[PDB]
From a paper:
The core of the glideosome consists of an atypical class XIV myosin A (PfMyoA) and a divergent actin (PfAct1). PfMyoA is a short myosin with a conserved globular motor domain and a lever arm that binds two light chains: an essential light chain (PfELC) and myosin tail interacting protein (MTIP). PfMyoA is a critical molecule in the parasite life-cycle because it powers the fast motility (~2 µm.s−1) required during motile sporozoite stages, and is essential for providing the force (up to 40 pN) needed for non-motile merozoites to invade erythrocytes. Here, we present the X-ray structures of full-length (FL) PfMyoA complexed to PfELC and MTIP in two states of the motor cycle.
Numbering used by the authors:
A (entry chain A): 20 to 371, 376 to 818
B (entry chain B): 74 to 204
C (entry chain C): 2 to 79, 82 to 134
Amino acid sequence: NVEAFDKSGSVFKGYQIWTDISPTIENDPNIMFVKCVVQQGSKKEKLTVVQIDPPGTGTPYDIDPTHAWNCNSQVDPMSFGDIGLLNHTNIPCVLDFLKHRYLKNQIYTTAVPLIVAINPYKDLGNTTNEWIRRYRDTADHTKLPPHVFTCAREALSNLHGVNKSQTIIVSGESGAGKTEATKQIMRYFASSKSGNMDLRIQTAIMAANPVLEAFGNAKTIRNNNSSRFGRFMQLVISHEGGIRYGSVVAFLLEKSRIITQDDNERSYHIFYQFLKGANSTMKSKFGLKGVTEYKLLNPNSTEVSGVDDVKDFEEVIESLKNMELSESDIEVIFSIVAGILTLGNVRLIEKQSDAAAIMDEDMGVFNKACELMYLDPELIKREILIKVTVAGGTKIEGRWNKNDAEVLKSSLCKAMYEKLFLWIIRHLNSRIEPEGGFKTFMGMLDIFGFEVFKNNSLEQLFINITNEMLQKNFVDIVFERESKLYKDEGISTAELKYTSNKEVINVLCEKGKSVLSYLEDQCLAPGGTDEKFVSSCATNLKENNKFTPAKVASNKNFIIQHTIGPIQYCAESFLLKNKDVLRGDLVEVIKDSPNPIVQQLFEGQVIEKGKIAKGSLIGSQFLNQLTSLMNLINSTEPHFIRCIKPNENKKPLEWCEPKILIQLHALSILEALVLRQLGYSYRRTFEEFLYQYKFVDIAAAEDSSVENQNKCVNILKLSGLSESMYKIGKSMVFLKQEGAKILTKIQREKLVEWENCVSVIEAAILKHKYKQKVNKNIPSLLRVQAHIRKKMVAQ
Amino acid sequence: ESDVRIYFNEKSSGGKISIDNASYNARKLGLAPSSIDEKKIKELYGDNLTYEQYLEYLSICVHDKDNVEELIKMFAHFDNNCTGYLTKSQMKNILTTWGDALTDQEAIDALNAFSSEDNIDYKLFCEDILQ
Amino acid sequence: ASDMEEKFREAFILFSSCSDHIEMYKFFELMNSFGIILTNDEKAALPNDINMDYWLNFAKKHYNYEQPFKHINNVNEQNVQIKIDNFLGIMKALDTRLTESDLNILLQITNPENKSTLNLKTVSQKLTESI
Ligand SMILES: Nc1ncnc2c1ncn2[C@@H]1O[C@H](COP(=O)(O)OP(=O)(O)O)[C@@H](O)[C@H]1O
Ligand SMILES: [Mg+2]
């Protein structure tokens, strides 16, 4: 806790610290901490500082020592890739290191086993073919800065090296850079050293990102190209580069977006792409109106800066063709899109207020919508307007009101879209999957990281459930690895134990005693509400501390105690959001379509005769998907890419300390350092330790009369370190972090004689290094001076 | 193009013009000559140049590769927190120390000409001098 | 006669990032670069906010014109050679600001070959030629 004073009790002349107290901090939301120097005369119980960075007034002020943090003064952040290698890993230190690297355009930085990637919001040209080649063909990969290609290389290296499947997991907030990382990593995997015969299957996989972004991405306030779903891929890369087989899985597609969008938010790209992009012939074929002339599409949001939908659309048509879709197949896809868009524009009115019907002006519109969707218009009209209640014993033919028929119409638009999207994926998989399945594959998950908002719904619950499963994966692989290491050197794995989220998993998933188990049972109930669900949850989950109720709206709100903190969810419309799946008889009308693609949309979709079955609901079906997806990932060796959005402004070189720190917490970058420090963290071979800690005791080091495993135990006993800080090991000297830091202090104490010499040496070399950098910029300077003089003549 | 022959005659002596005078003329025309361009022609025709050589010198004084991104390099080098702003004191020390060094007055003048404030946007300072 | 002012001035602005005030830590790098060494008391006695004019005065008062780098090797002592990887051992042990590249640069500049020992009488000698 800040070693600012000498033995005399006097402050070290110039002693720099980090601090959370400054007017700069008050006046600037971007800055969290400032650099200070501890003023001469400062007291032990309370310090007197002066701000040095960012520049200040010079005014001395007081801070309690619990607001002073150690400074990593005199350290080049571009000199090394892991945050853990810093002498001090406190919050302001870790943040600064990340900042300096960011502004020097080094975004990737590890926190073993994590790779932090800060969104530059600018093309750095670090993922070019020239960069893929460098990262692919370099002799010793370690003599290269951290990169997503570092992770892709390492992953493909272990897959082929020990014949074990691998999974790269890209996570973070919306607009942090997951999809871009995912696209870079794939681009690298597609670069072959000498070629690819399975180029047709590779070309189809690469043709899948534009297609998937068109149908699955949208312009949100937070991201202009926001992935509205979870993506999982299984790849089969040749050891010399080149994808050979693949399998794509989309999940949790945002259904609501097809119907309505918030403002400054668009629908799915394809709607915009297709309407601005379709040619004269295409427009008449389907009868297309302008982007503004469609109900399901927010008419204000229609344009996105830097996005050219006409050009993007051309690229989608080519991509669909490269996915081995015929001109007919493509024409069927766009007839279904024109159908979804046209059906939305059908108006419904109350037919007194008893039942409802189609507006006569809109009858042709309705019929065209069904034709385009290759559906029977009469039978579709029937399902939207005829209610078949089962009152008492018998079936009772009744009619749907305006609001209800509007909901069933919207249900069709949504279901038809989602199913078309999933079919496009299913078709791609048919042309890219290996006939007998995957022996050893390369997994790739592009999932939305932990989500916290002002109001959290069922959408964020499913995301935060998935994110709990991945965190379990992190902590288990952290343990597994560090535990196998100790075991191999014959060390006690006893002082090695850390937190399990098993307690919050049970409260969220476990059948019978979980939020999701009581969400399912309430949907299946012949009379269950959002209040009844929370009341049942607050009564049956008192056994674990992870389920807690709410202060304001106690029966409407509930809060779960996640790994990353307490997240409050609003149970309003939770029962509605789980029941949002197409209603049995309409599905039969679709399955009876003459067109082979429309028949294929709802293949084996079991009929909904009575009230919604277990596996029909969104929550139930999703837990099955997640469990299956998880077990497959738990089978592979993981890799973690953590993405950080540095600013809310989508701007380059704009660092925002507070936002960035919430992210360092949610992605466990800080905990990744914590875990790496614990136990016997310093581990280096007998030969290594002796090159390093030679001068602790030069006598025991400089000796032939003793072996290397024994030279070390001599130095260590003589050193002072308690046997409580070091273990000998089989091949490696295992030293605790604290022990290894003390041991260095002993070595420096021995070379007290060398201090002034090494000072002068280092200092002179830096002065030289410094002038050399200034020489590089001297031809540019000569220019500013030539023009200053040119400007002076003109007077 | 004609100003070239107009300016030449004014400082010329027996058909030949001194580099110091030839450089001054290049500035009047709107070109930015450095000690390199002067050492380039000195290395080819001496100190006094004919009309034929004068043009050949103004040919080297044509610096097209000149733009804000190219000029800021040195100022950008000392903007360690990457704000896009340097003090007048910082910028004065750069202009008066390395390269074709300006007088401590020439530097103050040009920085005071651009802004009143101590903190100068060197991207704008460079854009301005180039004009 | 030997006026180091031009060399002192430039060095201050290399460490001070062209500003006219250096922070303590960087002043210590600066003075050390000219072979100056201060005692913990001498240091404690310095002004908290060191400026250009202070440094230039101090530099004149403390720079050893007759023998800079006396701390690497003294010509008035006598015992000046040690193994190459031994030197680097001490360099790394004292947590140098220098990287694996800077260290090797210093090595081929001073040591012409790969001769088993590195002589300090030559380390001081080469650094003085690079003042
Ligand atoms: N590595 C990067 N280099 C340049 N721009 C990037 C990078 N990563 C992200 N971006 C920009 O940020 C936007 C949003 O990032 P994206 O990866 O698509 O979001 P998400 O994290 O939600 O998947 C991109 O469309 C792109 O403009
Ligand atoms: Mg995305």
